[PDB]
Design a protein around this motif. Structure first.
Motif, PDB file in Angstrom:
ATOM      1  N   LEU B 141     -10.045  55.526 -22.936  1.00  0.00           N
ATOM      2  CA  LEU B 141      -9.368  54.379 -23.132  1.00  0.00           C
ATOM      3  C   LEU B 141      -9.934  53.035 -23.022  1.00  0.00           C
ATOM      4  O   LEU B 141      -9.801  52.146 -23.852  1.00  0.00           O
ATOM      5  CB  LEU B 141      -8.101  54.272 -21.940  1.00  0.00           C
ATOM      6  CG  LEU B 141      -6.959  55.536 -22.318  1.00  0.00           C
ATOM      7  CD1 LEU B 141      -5.817  55.195 -21.363  1.00  0.00           C
ATOM      8  CD2 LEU B 141      -6.280  55.325 -23.692  1.00  0.00           C
ATOM      9  N   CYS B 142     -10.989  53.130 -22.172  1.00  0.00           N
ATOM     10  CA  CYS B 142     -11.718  51.762 -22.153  1.00  0.00           C
ATOM     11  C   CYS B 142     -12.700  51.902 -23.258  1.00  0.00           C
ATOM     12  O   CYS B 142     -12.820  50.443 -23.593  1.00  0.00           O
ATOM     13  CB  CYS B 142     -12.416  51.768 -20.597  1.00  0.00           C
ATOM     14  SG  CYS B 142     -13.505  50.369 -20.490  1.00  0.00           S
ATOM     15  N   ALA B 145     -10.619  50.611 -26.348  1.00  0.00           N
ATOM     16  CA  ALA B 145     -10.254  49.277 -26.319  1.00  0.00           C
ATOM     17  C   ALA B 145     -11.447  48.468 -26.398  1.00  0.00           C
ATOM     18  O   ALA B 145     -11.503  47.306 -27.232  1.00  0.00           O
ATOM     19  CB  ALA B 145      -9.464  48.958 -25.200  1.00  0.00           C
ATOM     20  N   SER B 146     -12.566  48.844 -25.915  1.00  0.00           N
ATOM     21  CA  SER B 146     -13.774  47.906 -26.101  1.00  0.00           C
ATOM     22  C   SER B 146     -14.463  47.986 -27.388  1.00  0.00           C
ATOM     23  O   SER B 146     -15.063  47.123 -27.801  1.00  0.00           O
ATOM     24  CB  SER B 146     -15.026  48.344 -25.046  1.00  0.00           C
ATOM     25  OG  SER B 146     -14.271  48.038 -23.814  1.00  0.00           O
ATOM     26  N   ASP B 148     -12.472  48.484 -30.238  1.00  0.00           N
ATOM     27  CA  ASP B 148     -11.858  48.304 -31.064  1.00  0.00           C
ATOM     28  C   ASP B 148     -11.893  47.130 -32.055  1.00  0.00           C
ATOM     29  O   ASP B 148     -12.230  45.991 -31.614  1.00  0.00           O
ATOM     30  CB  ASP B 148     -10.307  48.042 -30.459  1.00  0.00           C
ATOM     31  CG  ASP B 148      -8.954  48.584 -31.370  1.00  0.00           C
ATOM     32  OD1 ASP B 148      -9.226  48.582 -32.601  1.00  0.00           O
ATOM     33  OD2 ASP B 148      -8.172  49.081 -30.586  1.00  0.00           O
ATOM     34  N   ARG B 151      -9.485  43.973 -32.066  1.00  0.00           N
ATOM     35  CA  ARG B 151      -9.608  42.931 -30.747  1.00  0.00           C
ATOM     36  C   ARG B 151     -10.963  42.119 -30.917  1.00  0.00           C
ATOM     37  O   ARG B 151     -11.406  41.878 -30.024  1.00  0.00           O
ATOM     38  CB  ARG B 151      -9.656  43.758 -29.506  1.00  0.00           C
ATOM     39  CG  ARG B 151      -8.334  44.277 -28.996  1.00  0.00           C
ATOM     40  CD  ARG B 151      -8.683  45.258 -27.889  1.00  0.00           C
ATOM     41  NE  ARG B 151      -8.502  44.976 -26.595  1.00  0.00           N
ATOM     42  CZ  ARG B 151      -9.516  44.626 -25.668  1.00  0.00           C
ATOM     43  NH1 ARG B 151     -10.850  44.828 -26.314  1.00  0.00           N
ATOM     44  NH2 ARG B 151      -9.398  44.193 -24.723  1.00  0.00           N
TER      45      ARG B 151
ATOM     46  N   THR C  52     -10.956  47.926 -15.489  1.00  0.00           N
ATOM     47  CA  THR C  52     -11.198  48.932 -16.595  1.00  0.00           C
ATOM     48  C   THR C  52      -9.825  48.819 -17.309  1.00  0.00           C
ATOM     49  O   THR C  52      -9.776  48.785 -18.452  1.00  0.00           O
ATOM     50  CB  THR C  52     -11.452  50.308 -15.959  1.00  0.00           C
ATOM     51  OG1 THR C  52     -12.743  50.275 -15.273  1.00  0.00           O
ATOM     52  CG2 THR C  52     -11.466  51.317 -16.804  1.00  0.00           C
ATOM     53  N   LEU C  53      -8.688  48.714 -16.524  1.00  0.00           N
ATOM     54  CA  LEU C  53      -7.421  48.909 -17.336  1.00  0.00           C
ATOM     55  C   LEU C  53      -7.056  47.593 -18.028  1.00  0.00           C
ATOM     56  O   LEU C  53      -6.225  47.755 -18.962  1.00  0.00           O
ATOM     57  CB  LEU C  53      -6.508  49.223 -15.869  1.00  0.00           C
ATOM     58  CG  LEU C  53      -6.326  50.708 -15.649  1.00  0.00           C
ATOM     59  CD1 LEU C  53      -5.587  50.749 -14.172  1.00  0.00           C
ATOM     60  CD2 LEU C  53      -6.050  51.769 -16.694  1.00  0.00           C
ATOM     61  N   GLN C  55      -9.251  45.737 -19.737  1.00  0.00           N
ATOM     62  CA  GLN C  55     -10.075  45.800 -20.876  1.00  0.00           C
ATOM     63  C   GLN C  55      -9.166  46.911 -21.718  1.00  0.00           C
ATOM     64  O   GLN C  55      -9.106  46.913 -22.930  1.00  0.00           O
ATOM     65  CB  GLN C  55     -11.372  46.495 -20.463  1.00  0.00           C
ATOM     66  CG  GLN C  55     -12.020  46.688 -21.741  1.00  0.00           C
ATOM     67  CD  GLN C  55     -12.575  45.161 -22.513  1.00  0.00           C
ATOM     68  OE1 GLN C  55     -12.927  44.302 -21.904  1.00  0.00           O
ATOM     69  NE2 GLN C  55     -12.668  45.425 -23.760  1.00  0.00           N
ATOM     70  N   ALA C  56      -8.706  48.090 -20.815  1.00  0.00           N
ATOM     71  CA  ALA C  56      -8.010  49.216 -21.665  1.00  0.00           C
ATOM     72  C   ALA C  56      -6.817  48.773 -22.303  1.00  0.00           C
ATOM     73  O   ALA C  56      -6.402  49.193 -23.565  1.00  0.00           O
ATOM     74  CB  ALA C  56      -8.083  50.362 -20.859  1.00  0.00           C
ATOM     75  N   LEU C  57      -5.902  48.430 -21.377  1.00  0.00           N
ATOM     76  CA  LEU C  57      -4.504  48.143 -21.830  1.00  0.00           C
ATOM     77  C   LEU C  57      -3.972  46.765 -21.807  1.00  0.00           C
ATOM     78  O   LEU C  57      -2.682  46.368 -21.468  1.00  0.00           O
ATOM     79  CB  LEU C  57      -3.755  48.988 -20.764  1.00  0.00           C
ATOM     80  CG  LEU C  57      -3.961  50.577 -20.744  1.00  0.00           C
ATOM     81  CD1 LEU C  57      -3.168  50.951 -19.472  1.00  0.00           C
ATOM     82  CD2 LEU C  57      -3.637  51.109 -22.048  1.00  0.00           C
ATOM     83  N   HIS C  59      -4.465  44.383 -24.257  1.00  0.00           N
ATOM     84  CA  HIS C  59      -3.918  44.069 -25.449  1.00  0.00           C
ATOM     85  C   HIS C  59      -2.713  44.884 -25.880  1.00  0.00           C
ATOM     86  O   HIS C  59      -2.076  44.377 -26.900  1.00  0.00           O
ATOM     87  CB  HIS C  59      -5.145  44.338 -26.406  1.00  0.00           C
ATOM     88  CG  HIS C  59      -5.316  45.551 -26.468  1.00  0.00           C
ATOM     89  ND1 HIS C  59      -6.017  46.293 -25.772  1.00  0.00           N
ATOM     90  CD2 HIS C  59      -5.145  46.977 -27.465  1.00  0.00           C
ATOM     91  CE1 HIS C  59      -6.535  47.428 -25.948  1.00  0.00           C
ATOM     92  NE2 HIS C  59      -5.877  47.933 -27.176  1.00  0.00           N
TER      93      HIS C  59
END
Lengths: 239, 239, 239, 239
Positions: B141-142, B145-146, B148, B151, C52-53, C55-57, C59
């Motif tokens: 998940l990290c 997102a990183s 993506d 973003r 971490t979260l 960054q992950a969640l 957005h």
């Protein structure tokens, strides 16, 4: 290039960076009796020491703070031969001055060997030079990627990533040789204390690893678009 | 895609990344008698090892450094099947080569089990696979997102956040299984040392957690705008 | 707003973020007999867990991962009342589910009290609530600054700074109450273990500190240009 | 400038930043009997305390959180004399209020000397002031580089680099003087506890090092393009 004022500021920045890196790195690696520093604690001191100076002096001199990185930049045609000569001279002079200042401020009962690089944990010289080859290979790869102009779309964290790359190697190389990764950092307390046991490991190791790391990035991993004439112009002091 | 020179550089980058990650990660996790590494100290070595290599080799191969992340990218239609096949092959070959180099440089009295993943603290296999499912779920998940592209307004710290996500899992997973989070990192010392006790946990765990993490991000949390034809074109080696 | 698909993804993201934060945070704070976690080691687990979260969640839902931060965003007119209601419900449900999963995977000899927040070091309830007021005040100030749209000229590190702000409070609050800073993180092991001694400190403390932190930023330190009608439109579910 | 509302918010931000920095920094440096903080653990608390407040309050007041940095900014013609006067007054008042709050919430058996700066490891006053000169020299160089407007092409991590620069100095200066680096941080527990032994080191040291660090950056390393009239206009409260 030598006559430029910005070049003189770059040599002094490399002199001051290696002076502070040896001051803050070796001092935190000393054998303090009340609170003996852990491997992670020494790693972050050497780690955040580079990261602080890359943020502080990266825009002035590039913040090599290492002859190995300076040699790696010289092989990768990123700096001139005359700039690499003056950077190494500034790094070696700054390191000894940084270690002499630390030796003069630390109590006599605490300096001991001033945190010289030595073969620890019954590691032989053959195994030791192999670690330093890989310790500086990841540093040079991280430095070249962080300072790559082709990656302007994602600036990232050039200061922290380079700094944390030094901390990464110290979490491994402390158990073998104290994690030299820098001929200047190794020669700084060796000159003061006169302890030059197996000192070739801390010079051959980081230099070969930086050369291999520079040849990997600039010729194998991410080759640039510079021609043969462009590479020779950068090396032989041409603007 | 296979005939491309940039693809060959990506496979070598994944080979070199897993070689360095296993070298710097397992070596710092060894049972050093003079200074036994703490859970945080091992966490930062595995943590900053990924963060350094993502900075160093993220722009060349994506810096998966993990079959689980490679599988997660394959399920999320981010990489092709042929690229995922070659990345896993490069990751598994690089890991064993990284562990064999570490086994050859470390003293015999110190290698021991070369930091193999094993069920620690009386944790059963049932509980162990559940931790590895969640350890790699937060990493994937990290990573997604990183990396993506949606973003782009906030690049953030792709290298450090991914690196610190590995450190986050190691602060938890060390007490259970040594925090595998990577089939390559688990198979690297298991092949050398011949210790394959409960090895399915370190493969089923991270792979299922990466698949669930990839299906959560790409189909539940942040679905992209890619059509069915676009997803099949990316997977089956079409540019 | 409730009927929106992106809102349902935000509630699930807050459910999953608090599930992972409690899973990775409380598990690393357990009393492991072989390797008892240090205050810094627990601080980085709680610290990098938020980082971490975020960054992950971040957005997807904003990555509050805290009723106190959700209340702080509600007072600062950053989220609606209905979104704050659903975020707190998702945070409290995710936390208990995160602690129940951790209690089911950890050995019985190791769970103990599952790292419940308790008054430690002979700290009274009066002093304890004062620490939690300041522990969450710096978190809310760092979150509002990191997520401020007026600071688009310098994006900085929203994920790491918010994450390291949680680590900063844990280096202080562990010695007093285990550093709650989160009503969900406190209620998660209290429900499972039935240990509700002085539980009002971990609710009154972080909530009052978040309200004061939100009123300081949005009305004293950096007031926005939103009018009275604009603030009421954001709160009462109007787009 | 004094009549401006944004200036009053800046003075309160400096008051609140030094209040939180002393609260979170000195509290984590106390002699906790159950878990005595390590040198790295205290370094990260002082380190991430500045990094959190620079992220939180950098856009409001600049987040000096230090008379030495405020003096360094005054010498470098970055702030006015009246702003530097009010920032130091806010920093000294906030520090004492931060230490008095910490002294009132900590158990009597734990406060002890409230982590006053003292000459440790048999370090004399002569060696101690030399460390503090270099401890604050790297902080000021990192602050000026992180807050340099000429480096807008690479924003980097102003909050983390400045924060990690404080952590870098604490990995060294704890073994000598507890790593003052801040006259406000030193005067905060000295006033409460009445322990003023060798207190001139923690004032002469950081101030001289900040002046030398400011003169190095603004006149030797990276001189700006400001004229003599421009520098005098900034200092003497002219917009």
């Amino acid at each position: 290039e030598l006559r430029s004022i910005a070049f003189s500021r770059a040599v002094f920045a490399e002199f001051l960076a290696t002076l502070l890196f040896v001051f803050f790195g070796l001092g935190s690696a000393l054998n303090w009796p009340q609170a003996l520093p852990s491997v992670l604690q020494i790693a972050m001191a050497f780690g955040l020491g580079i990261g602080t100076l890359v943020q502080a002096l990266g825009h002035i001199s590039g913040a090599h703070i290492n002859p190995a990185v300076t040699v790696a930049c010289l092989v990768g045609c990123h700096v001139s031969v005359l700039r690499a000569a003056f950077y190494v001279a500034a790094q070696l002079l700054g390191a000894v001055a940084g270690a002499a200042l630390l030796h003069e401020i630390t109590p006599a009962d605490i300096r001991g060997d001033l945190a010289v690089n030595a073969l620890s944990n019954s590691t032989t010289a053959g195994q030791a030079v192999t670690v330093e080859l890989f310790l500086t290979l990841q540093l040079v790869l991280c430095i070249f990627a962080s300072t790559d102009e082709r990656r302007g779309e994602n600036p990232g964290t050039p200061a922290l990533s380079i700094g944390f790359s030094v901390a990464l190697g110290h979490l491994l190389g402390i158990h073998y040789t104290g994690c030299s990764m820098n001929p200047a950092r190794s020669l700084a307390p060796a000159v003061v204390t006169g302890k030059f046991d197996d000192h070739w490991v801390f010079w051959i190791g980081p230099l070969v690893g930086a050369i291999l790391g520079s040849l990997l990035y600039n010729y194998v991993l991410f080759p640039p678009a510079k021609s043969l004439s462009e590479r020779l112009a950068v090396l032989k002091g041409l603007e």
